[PDB]
Amino acid sequence: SSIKKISFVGIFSALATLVMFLEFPIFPQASFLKYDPSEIPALIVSFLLGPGVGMFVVLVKDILFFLMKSGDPVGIAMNAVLGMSFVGIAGLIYHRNKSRATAIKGMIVATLFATAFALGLNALIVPLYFEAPFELYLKFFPFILAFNLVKFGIDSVVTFFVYKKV
Ligand SMILES: Cc1cc2nc3c(=O)[nH]c(=O)nc-3n(C[C@H](O)[C@H](O)[C@H](O)CO)c2cc1C
Numbered sequence: 001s002s003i004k005k006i007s008f009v010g011i012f013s014a015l016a017t018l019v020m021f022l023e024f025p026i027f028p029q030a031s032f033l034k035y036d037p038s039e040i041p042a043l044i045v046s047f048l049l050g051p052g053v054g055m056f057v058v059l060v061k062d063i064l065f066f067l068m069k070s071g072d073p074v075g076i077a078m079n080a081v082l083g084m085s086f087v088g089i090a091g092l093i094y095h096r097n098k099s100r101a102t103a104i105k106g107m108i109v110a111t112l113f114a115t116a117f118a119l120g121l122n123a124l125i126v127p128l129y130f131e132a133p134f135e136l137y138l139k140f141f142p143f144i145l146a147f148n149l150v151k152f153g154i155d156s157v158v159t160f161f162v163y164k165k166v
């Protein structure tokens, strides 16, 4: 009903901006990697309303979260770029032909893509963010792998329990 779903998007993006405050490192070595469940409202909006909408909410979520945490411009752009890639790919697989089999085929792939996109991103980001040589990224490599694999893997299954609980 247009005005119905636009506020649905509005409050869901605001929901995701709030849970982004419960972020924790989970990895003491790679402390900059912080997990929040703020990609689960996006993954739900992306399934109902479309991939482009799901990437819209993580874009505005982080913009809001950046306006309130105006100090991590690189660590929020990384989150958005990776988050937009996760919900966009997952929404596309479940789109076209709506099916439960594709809904898990998409979350398996979207978890694997975002993880690969993060490693390729941090290869030329971690050296510059810490003003350090490329070997520091190699020290951080298995933690970036396990993190985004677990982060989007958890977001995938937790969204699945909700999608199956109806
Ligand atoms: C150098 C750096 C690397 C990051 N890498 C990832 C990542 O690989 N996967 C991810 O989900 N989030 C990543 N983040 C997301 C991070 O939790 C978010 O941007 C926080 O708000 C950091 O300020 C990264 C952040 C920074 C600063």
Ligand SMILES: CCCCCCCCCO[C@@H]1O[C@H](CO)[C@@H](O)[C@H](O)[C@H]1O
Residues within 6 Å of the ligand: 015, 016, 019, 037, 038, 040, 041, 044, 158, 162
């Ligand atoms: C319109 C139908 C959609 C289904 C209803 C589910 C509502 C939200 C999805 O789950 C929950 O969202 C919270 C807020 O972000 C998270 O804190 C929590 O971890 C997660 O479990």
Ligand SMILES: CCCCCCCCCO[C@@H]1O[C@H](CO)[C@@H](O)[C@H](O)[C@H]1O
Residues within 6 Å of the ligand: 127, 128, 131, 132, 133, 134, 135
């Ligand atoms: C083996 C000898 C040399 C090759 C090492 C591999 C590549 C490392 C590059 O170092 C550079 O150092 C700067 C400051 O130290 C960083 O700001 C910069 O991001 C980084 O690009």
